[PDB]
Design a protein around this ligand. Structure first.
Ligand code: NA
Length: 214
């Protein structure tokens, strides 16, 4: 039912293990439309997500996700988020209504307004409110760093370059979800993300993702 351990180096588009969001907007606070053309693979082997504009105040963003669902285990990413007011660069697990389940999600999010910090959160049956902002001690937009979360039945443990930065024990998610990565500009969450100034193009880079099942 759920996928097994894998290593993803982003050398090319593998249309059997991953897919590109295309032609729709998540709406709400998401003020951009997902475009497959904004999901690119560099020559030096990176997944590079772009936030673009081709029309007056009309933003094109990007998301990449697995075709498989995954359960408990260690999730690791090597990435460099975009730095700009009003955006988010992330790594997260997601399952929800549209997949015929409750909304269960675990996140690693970079608020563009300040890439010196990272935000950790999780949703269980759509109940969030577990935000934890960590000062990284470096500017994540400057180099690649390894971010990870160890998802187990009774806990969630988040790591930065192999160092434990946060542990959560309350109302932990349990529904297996897809692995996702995206870059987007917000609307009406100025408080949280800063307002978006329309700066384009903007890019988030990913060197690899690794999943280790129990
Ligand atoms: Na890579």
């Amino acid at each position: 039912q759920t996928g097994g351990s894998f290593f993803e180096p982003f050398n090319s588009y593998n249309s059997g293990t991953w897919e590109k969001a295309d032609g729709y907007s998540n709406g709400g606070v998401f003020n951009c439309t997902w475009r497959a053309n904004n999901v690119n693979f560099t020559n030096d082997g990176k997944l590079k997500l772009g936030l673009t504009s081709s029309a007056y105040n009309k933003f094109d963003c990007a998301e990449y996700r697995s075709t498989n669902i995954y359960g408990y285990g260690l999730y690791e990413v090597s990435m460099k988020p975009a730095k700009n007011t009003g955006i988010v660069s992330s790594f997260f697990t997601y399952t929800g209504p549209a997949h015929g389940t409750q909304w269960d999600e675990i996140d690693i999010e970079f608020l563009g307004k300040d890439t010196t910090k990272v935000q950790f959160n999780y949703y269980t049956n759509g109940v969030g409110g577990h935000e934890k902002v960590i000062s990284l001690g470096f500017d994540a937009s400057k180099g690649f760093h390894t971010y990870a979360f160890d998802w187990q039945p009774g806990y969630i443990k988040w790591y930065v370059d192999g160092v434990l930065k946060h542990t959560a024990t309350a109302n932990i998610p349990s529904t297996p979800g897809k692995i996702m990565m995206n870059l987007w500009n917000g609307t009406g969450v100025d408080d949280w993300l800063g307002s978006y100034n329309g700066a384009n193009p903007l890019y988030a880079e990913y060197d690899w993702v690794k999943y280790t099942s129990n």
